[PDB]
Symmetry: D2
Subunit: 259 residues, 4 copies
Amino acid sequence: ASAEFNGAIAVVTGAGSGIGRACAELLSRSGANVIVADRDIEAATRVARATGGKTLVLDVGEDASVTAAANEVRARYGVADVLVNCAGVLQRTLPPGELAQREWDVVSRIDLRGTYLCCAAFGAPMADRRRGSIVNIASVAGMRSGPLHAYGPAKAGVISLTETLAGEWGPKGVRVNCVSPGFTQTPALERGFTTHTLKADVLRDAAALGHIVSANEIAEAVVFLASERASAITGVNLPVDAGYLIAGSWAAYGGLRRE
Amino acid sequence: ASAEFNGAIAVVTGAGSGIGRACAELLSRSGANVIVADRDIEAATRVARATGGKTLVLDVGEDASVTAAANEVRARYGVADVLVNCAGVLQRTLPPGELAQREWDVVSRIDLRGTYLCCAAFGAPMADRRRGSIVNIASVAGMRSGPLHAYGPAKAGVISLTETLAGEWGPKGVRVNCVSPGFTQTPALERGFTTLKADVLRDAAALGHIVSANEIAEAVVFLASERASAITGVNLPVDAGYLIAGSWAAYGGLRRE
Amino acid sequence: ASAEFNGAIAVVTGAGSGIGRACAELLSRSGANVIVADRDIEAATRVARATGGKTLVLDVGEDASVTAAANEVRARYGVADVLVNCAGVLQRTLPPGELAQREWDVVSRIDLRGTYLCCAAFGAPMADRRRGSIVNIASVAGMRSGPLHAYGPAKAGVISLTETLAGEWGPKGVRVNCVSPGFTQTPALERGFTTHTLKADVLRDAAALGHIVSANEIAEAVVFLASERASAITGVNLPVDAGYLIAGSWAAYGGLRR
Amino acid sequence: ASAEFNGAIAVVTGAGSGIGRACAELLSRSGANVIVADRDIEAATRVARATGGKTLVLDVGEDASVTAAANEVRARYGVADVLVNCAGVLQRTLPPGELAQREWDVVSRIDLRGTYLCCAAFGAPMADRRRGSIVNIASVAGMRSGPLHAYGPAKAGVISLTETLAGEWGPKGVRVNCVSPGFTQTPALERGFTTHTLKADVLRDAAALGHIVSANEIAEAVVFLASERASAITGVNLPVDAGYLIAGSWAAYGGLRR
Ligand SMILES: NC(=O)c1ccc[n+]([C@@H]2O[C@H](COP(=O)([O-])OP(=O)(O)OC[C@H]3O[C@@H](n4cnc5c(N)ncnc54)[C@H](O)[C@@H]3O)[C@@H](O)[C@H]2O)c1
Ligand SMILES: NC(=O)c1ccc[n+]([C@@H]2O[C@H](COP(=O)([O-])OP(=O)(O)OC[C@H]3O[C@@H](n4cnc5c(N)ncnc54)[C@H](O)[C@@H]3O)[C@@H](O)[C@H]2O)c1
Ligand SMILES: NC(=O)c1ccc[n+]([C@@H]2O[C@H](COP(=O)([O-])OP(=O)(O)OC[C@H]3O[C@@H](n4cnc5c(N)ncnc54)[C@H](O)[C@@H]3O)[C@@H](O)[C@H]2O)c1
Ligand SMILES: NC(=O)c1ccc[n+]([C@@H]2O[C@H](COP(=O)([O-])OP(=O)(O)OC[C@H]3O[C@@H](n4cnc5c(N)ncnc54)[C@H](O)[C@@H]3O)[C@@H](O)[C@H]2O)c1
């Protein structure tokens, strides 16, 4: 535990599960007053009870929901000091034509547009106040090819939006960065194992360190960038991926040189 | 003029103006049978008359329009050999909160989703046929910071989608690449001068030029052609050195004449 | 039919073999007056006889050789219109400690420093004359991880130097770009097969298009960038790799769908 | 507390001044046993008196110096747990031809080759023991164009080498990452002000946050990556630049909105 965020209001979207839960837990253990924001109130309530945080009902796919949630935070607590955008959904890894356009649309709406909605609603007041730190959650899938024709582009959009906002709000004292997880142990990744969409040993083999990343490891990088340890860092994308991005190019040379 | 695309069916979206028009002109001068596709039927027809191409009514923001256009092409001409995705719109350069969410949505719908709609509708038949070349139009704005919180992310999405498709369809023999224009002289840029200042754009590029639509088209046509037979999944900036020049300010700026 | 150079003077380093040979051949077929430059005069002569170009002895690891070559070009032909830096060497794919420091030093000296030597010697006069186009040869190995602790860094150095020079000389009308080949069929790649450092089917499998790149395919990209068809392109790195950079990230999803 | 190292041995090169000094200081405050390594014993002694660390004479431009220093660390303390490569030099911002080749060579030898020498000498034993964390210092100048035809390429080389080593040694449990500072307040930057090579207000204006980066701010990112809080991070380049990389592209739109 630490006092690094004592007094800080930290809104974490998607905080009921996975990466957002781990960020909420670490921010709370670091002293922050965490707003546990999720569309799933049961999950958010469980996390808030464990962290001492406060729940906020938030559907990032619904403009009215985001606007209302932002107004509730301002009225009840104050201008957010930290915003972490973890709400997101995955997609089936289907090629164009097999992937339903409806599925493509949902991924874009939640993962890119929903992050924009929250940055605008929670972050514009930060720029007005002249202080704040925003951390978005992108993905290695936003950085390289893969069978994710909605999720890849949406996460690449998050990397871009992190850069555009960092330039817009830098002169107003707000830092905006993003973390790009590799394959991270969460209930979403477990559902991929259950549908046989992914295989755990295949994911380990695809990473230079031979590990699947833990939600807590992602949260450490988010909290670093959200904190004053990162006071000079803005507009960056930090991959936390156990070396996934490193390993793929070794196959032409016979693969990683393993134990 | 050349025969490099003799016999090829080349669908160009947004071909009524600007970059798409220059691509249609150069593809036609290179021998292709150009399908001049646009939401603006009068503009498409002017370009088709000049190029010997054929018009195709296409609104990349309407799924039914894209599906019908792809079906017309397949029945009247055949499977496309080349698809160039130039249809697109710009946005007002407003910060979050000032930019209307409706404006953000339109840009994402046309510039990213509309390119996906056309890649799926025209490009899946290419993958089934085991040959084709697709060139998307991104932007330097998809590569660096700027005051375009819809357009930047959408164009970054185009760069990503070019990569994801190149991997999906590489084993089926379809190459997918993208060109990222800098500031390019088109009627859309002229509307910016009447938001943007021409001297400022020249100063922001290492070569001191605004890119012409024809210069963009040369890069598109290179990537679409067999001169690029081993090139897939790449983003080619055609920007007069905009991406190069910004980092010089800390050292006193470009060292000019 | 790829471009027209109208007699432009084009100096190609490493032009006796592989990528440089293919660049010299296509430039000559495209109307350029090619200067076939190489450390191996016998290989340069063979290529120059086939291209109608002229030979130039050039060892990019020897400062005096680069200076003397630039002086010969200036006196005999004039300032170059095009420079293509293809001279290069590979390395054994050994981890640090197994890799001899002497091997590391050679690769850095030839592949990065030697390209800098030629850009300074042949390219500064281009900037003085307010025109020219320079194409460097980097590699996908300068863009991603691999067992190449000298060659990767040197080729990443070439990508950077392309950007730095593009900015220095952009205002003087000189474009500077680079091509990053993937695995390309040359005698240097053949030595990787013979020594069993590389396996041809493994290289095809590692590319989204399932091919090894040909030297001519690299030359087409070099010639495009060197030509007026690329008059607005500067400071860019163009990968020509059959989709090597694309394919590696698919393994986590079960690999390429073949 | 930024991190806890529990007595881990941390070798910091260039630790007598600037970024290396700040890294040594924060590592010591975070519980590491710091080895303050520098070519200048006087500066290293001053830093080590403040950190309780131990001094090591190290010239990263002399192979025998690096080898002897690694042997002394192994003999006196053990295999390093952490290595931070901060030894470096800048260059005059001159175009090719005006920049002496001797100046180009020094920058490449110290900034890229010297980092490779240290990664090989101190890092191969880490891979052998199956544990360690290495942080290299690159620069934003290794990521974008500028008037730095040696320093840009050398620092791009460091970003590459970080990736190549991360792949080589990842399977042996060693993480390798790098930090790319922007303009950072050190004696080296002050020499740029004194020579009027740089102007402080120009550097602030070129960053989205309007600041010059402090040496301590760089050290925080180095210590995060070196620590177990970054146990899943390898092969990455983390810019710490107050938004320099963000700001340049705004000029076309009228500049930053201040
Ligand atoms: N798990 C991975 O391997 C991985 C990898 C890369 C990126 N990511 C990204 O990290 C973030 C979280 O991933 P996760 O693994 O923690 O998934 P998760 O399913 O375990 O948690 C996601 C949370 O987001 C909430 N949520 C979903 N849609 C929402 C909506 N419209 N409005 C509000 N809340 C919504 C969910 O209720 C859920 O609690 C996502 O952006 C994900 O794309 C995850
Ligand atoms: N001009 C530049 O500086 C510049 C820079 C970077 C990127 N781009 C991109 O190049 C592409 C073309 O730009 P331009 O300068 O030629 O603009 P332009 O206005 O001159 O031409 C754009 C064409 O797209 C058509 N179009 C717009 N929406 C459409 C829709 N839903 N369906 C079908 N057609 C539609 C328009 O009718 C028009 O004919 C765009 O993607 C643009 O974002 C332009
Ligand atoms: N073949 C590939 O797969 C591949 C991949 C990526 C990059 N590259 C790069 O392409 C360029 C050409 O490679 P290649 O495959 O054609 O090799 P190659 O052996 O077929 O030809 C290389 C030429 O460079 C000459 N040369 C070597 N050192 C020289 C020196 N100091 N001075 C003058 N000439 C010298 C050689 O005599 C030879 O003629 C190199 O830079 C290489 O690193 C090659
Ligand atoms: N200051 C900046 O703005 C900035 C920006 C980007 C990157 N960097 C990089 O950070 C690192 C340190 O920069 P700094 O500002 O702290 O410089 P500095 O002059 O303040 O300190 C550098 C230290 O490196 C030592 N050193 C130099 N050459 C050496 C050699 N052969 N062997 C051993 N020690 C040697 C010096 O004795 C000195 O103590 C460098 O790699 C630099 O390139 C600095």
